[PDB]
Amino acid sequence: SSNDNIELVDFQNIMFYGDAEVGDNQQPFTFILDTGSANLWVPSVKCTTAGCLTKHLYDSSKSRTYEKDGTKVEMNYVSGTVSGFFSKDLVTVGNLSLPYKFIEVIDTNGFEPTYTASTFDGILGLGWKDLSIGSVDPIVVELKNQNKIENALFTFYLPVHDKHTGFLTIGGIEERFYEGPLTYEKLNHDLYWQITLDAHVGNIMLEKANCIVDSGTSAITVPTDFLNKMLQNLDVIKVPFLPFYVTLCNNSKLPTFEFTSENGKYTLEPEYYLQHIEDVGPGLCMLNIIGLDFPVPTFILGDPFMRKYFTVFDYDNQSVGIALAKKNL
Ligand SMILES: CC(C)c1nc(CN(C)C(=O)N[C@H](C(=O)N[C@@H](Cc2ccccc2)C[C@H](O)[C@H](Cc2ccccc2)NC(=O)OCc2cncs2)C(C)C)cs1
Ligand SMILES: C[C@H](CCC(=O)NCCC[N+](C)(C)CCCS(=O)(=O)[O-])[C@H]1CC[C@H]2[C@@H]3[C@H](O)C[C@@H]4C[C@H](O)CC[C@]4(C)[C@H]3C[C@H](O)[C@]12C
Ligand SMILES: C[C@H](CCC(=O)NCCC[N+](C)(C)CCCS(=O)(=O)[O-])[C@H]1CC[C@H]2[C@@H]3[C@H](O)C[C@@H]4C[C@H](O)CC[C@]4(C)[C@H]3C[C@H](O)[C@]12C
């Protein structure tokens, strides 16, 4: 009905979070909404670590829909590890509710310093079942199976800093969120939001590259070889000890990413991957790009791509729909 959604709030023009609840008493948590994972976790009142002092914590004893599991789980992300045990309780996203298996986290030491530095309490996975720990049906799929929504799909309309808030819409496509044509790219993986695109950056290209559309990566990642070729004679300087590159914001050597399919063309101009850091010096920007090598040459089209392009994640049609995000409104 209409279209169920959760508001997306920009954090310092580099991350975005949405709020959902756990327990029949609707205990509120702030989440990274992560299309690149397939589990929900919240920090427990039983959490024994420094990071949890600054967070909204889940109290299973205060929920009468809580069902004990206790199966120990370690959740290993590329950027950190959280551990605890499975619990079952009511999960509410927008105005949609369902009983759900999630991880009750008691150790966040492996998630620092990012955890304490950030406003999110946990991570809400929007991936595929066979990627999940504990064989958990994805929230959006379950809601469709329960006839709580018209379609097993969700859309990302990211917030733009000082322009507009964003929305995760569950169960329907709103035309308000995108201008121009919506192009559907079929998945090249059984259990990941990953599509095939030719990647062109200036004179260098990777043919039929694996491209993950990842709401839960706050950067563009490119293969390390590709990045080394991109940055040759570009007048950019890497930060000592850190995989981040600094440039003059006005550096006209900075290239436009061009990603092409049989039916689509997506470009990402420097304004979409530049981060102003003028506290550090005059007219200096960081590139929101990092080198990351997968066994197959892979790009992560993270936050910076999804700031520019509205995205539809369709379980039933096993495709990602891409359209230019509407600027205002
Ligand atoms: C400067 C810039 C780099 C910034 N990053 C941030 C926030 N960070 C740390 C990230 O986004 N980091 C990314 C990340 O790990 N994202 C993660 C969420 C997260 C965020 C913050 C801290 C800890 C975890 C979420 C991403 O979807 C990644 C994508 C991925 C998957 C496999 C292999 C490589 C990459 N997913 C996972 O790591 O999930 C693995 C799984 C575990 N169980 C099932 S799959 C990396 C891919 C770069 C703020 S500013
Ligand atoms: C998971 C990857 C490392 C992948 C890996 O294990 N790579 C081994 C091969 C290395 N090389 C390609 C250089 C060898 C090939 C030689 S070649 O000549 O081919 O280049 C590592 C490398 C740099 C890491 C980030 C930074 O720490 C900054 C920050 C610290 C926070 O706390 C957590 C978040 C964040 C964003 C980190 C996330 C993640 O953790 C990254 C991407
Ligand atoms: C081979 C590497 C893993 C790292 C590696 O180089 N070697 C480890 C071998 C495998 N494990 C030891 C984890 C097996 C555990 C079972 S064991 O029997 O060992 O206990 C490959 C094999 C399959 C890959 C994932 C899947 O494609 C799905 C998905 C595609 C996206 O594009 C990127 C994210 C993700 C989760 C991929 C991550 C990573 O890229 C994997 C684990």
Q: Are 111 and 81 in contact (CB under 8 A)?
A: yes
111 closest CA partner among 56, 74, 136, 138: 74
CA 213 / ligand 3 centre spacing (Å): 18
Output helix, strand, coil percentages for the chain, rounded to the nearest 5.
15, 45, 40
Pocket probe for ligand 1: among 31, 78, 118, the residue whose CB has the most ligand atoms within 8 Å is 78
Cβ-based neighbours of 183, under 8 Å, separated by 6 or more: 261, 263, 264, 321, 322, 323
How far apart, in whole angstroms, are the C-alpha atoms of residue 48 and residue 43? 10
Token pair, residue 299, equals 């790009």
How far apart, in whole angstroms, are the C-alpha atoms of residue 109 and residue 47? 10
Residue 9's Cβ-count burial label (10 Å; 0-12, 13-18, 19+) is: middle
How far apart, in whole angstroms, are the C-alpha atoms of residue 218 and residue 13? 10
How far apart, in whole angstroms, are the C-alpha atoms of residue 196 and residue 189? 10
Cβ-based neighbours of 122, under 8 Å, separated by 6 or more: 29, 30, 31, 32, 40, 41, 42, 43, 105
CA 105 / ligand 3 centre spacing (Å): 24
CA 240 / ligand 2 centre spacing (Å): 14
CA 104 to chain CA mean position, Å: 21
Helices (H), the chain: 114-117, 139-145, 224-231, 270-273, 303-308
Domain that holds residue 77: 5-170
End-to-end CA distance of the chain: 21
At 153, which CATH number? 2.40.70.10
Output DSSP code: residue 44: B
Pocket probe for ligand 3: among 190, 192, 211, 222, the residue whose CB has the most ligand atoms within 8 Å is 192
Token pair, residue 163, equals 């322009």
Phi, psi of 327 (to 5 degrees): -70, -75
Residue 149's Cβ-count burial label (10 Å; 0-12, 13-18, 19+) is: buried
CA 146 / ligand 1 centre spacing (Å): 30
What count of Cα atoms within 13 Å lies in the side-chain half-sphere of residue 186? 4
Render the burial of 279-317: b for 16+ CB within 10 Å, e for the rest: eeeeebbbbbbbbbeeeebbbbbbbbbbbbbbbbbbbee
How far apart, in whole angstroms, are the C-alpha atoms of residue 90 and residue 143? 13
Cβ-based neighbours of 137, under 8 Å, separated by 6 or more: 129, 145
Cβ-based neighbours of 146, under 8 Å, separated by 6 or more: 98
Which atom of ligand 3 approaches the CA of 194 most closely?
32
Which atom of ligand 1 approaches the CA of 34 most closely?
27
C-beta pairs of 94-99 under 8 Å, 24+ apart in sequence: 94/4, 94/5, 94/6, 94/170, 95/4, 96/4, 96/143, 96/148, 96/149, 96/170, 96/171, 98/139, 98/142, 98/143, 98/146, 98/148, 99/65, 99/67
SS3 217: coil
153 closest CA partner among 320, 300, 324: 320
Q: Are 100 and 88 in contact (CB under 8 A)?
A: yes
Elucidation method: X-ray
Instruction: Give the closest residue (by CA) to ligand 3 atom 35.
Output: 192
How far apart, in whole angstroms, are the C-alpha atoms of residue 322 and residue 311? 5
Q: What angle do CA 326, 260, 201 make, to 5 degrees?
A: 95
Q: Are 208 and 194 in contact (CB under 8 A)?
A: no
List Cα–Cα distances, 216 to 14, 68, 125, 175, in angstroms. Answer: 11, 28, 9, 24
List Cα–Cα distances, 106 to 37, 46, 253, in angstroms. Answer: 19, 6, 47
Instruction: Give the closest residue (by CA) to ligand 2 atom 40.
Output: 79
Sign of CA pseudo-dihedral 65, 69, 70, 72: negative
Token pair 């003059």 is found at: 248
Pocket probe for ligand 2: among 14, 15, 76, 78, the residue whose CB has the most ligand atoms within 8 Å is 78
Q: Are 154 and 140 in contact (CB under 8 A)?
A: yes
What count of Cα atoms within 13 Å lies in the side-chain half-sphere of residue 40? 26
| Active site positions, annotated | 34, 214
> What stretch of H or E contains 260?
strand 257-260
What count of Cα atoms within 13 Å lies in the side-chain half-sphere of residue 134? 22
321 closest CA partner among 266, 270, 271, 268: 266
Q: Are 33 and 17 in contact (CB under 8 A)?
A: yes
List Cα–Cα distances, 98 to 70, 194, 256, in angstroms. Answer: 20, 27, 43
How far apart, in whole angstroms, are the C-alpha atoms of residue 17 and residue 212? 19
Reduced 3-state DSSP string for 4-39: EEEEEEEECCCEEEEEEEECCCCEEEEEEEECCCCC
List Cα–Cα distances, 240 to 88, 246, 282, in angstroms. Answer: 45, 11, 19
CA 316 to chain CA mean position, Å: 20
18 closest CA partner among 119, 113, 91: 119
Phi, psi of 170 (to 5 degrees): -105, 115
How far apart, in whole angstroms, are the C-alpha atoms of residue 118 and residue 275? 17
Q: Are 41 and 52 in contact (CB under 8 A)?
A: no
> What stretch of H or E contains 248?
strand 245-248
Task: Name residue 10's beta-bridge partners.
Answer: 16
CA 13 to chain CA mean position, Å: 14
Token pair, residue 211, equals 């491209």
Q: What is the resolution of this structure in A?
A: 1.9
Token pair, residue 296, equals 């197959």
Ligand 3 site residues (CB inside 6 A) read 189, 192, 194, 210, 212, 294-295, 298
List Cα–Cα distances, 156 to 94, 179, 308, in angstroms. Answer: 14, 14, 11
What count of Cα atoms within 13 Å lies in the side-chain half-sphere of residue 18? 25
SS3 103: strand
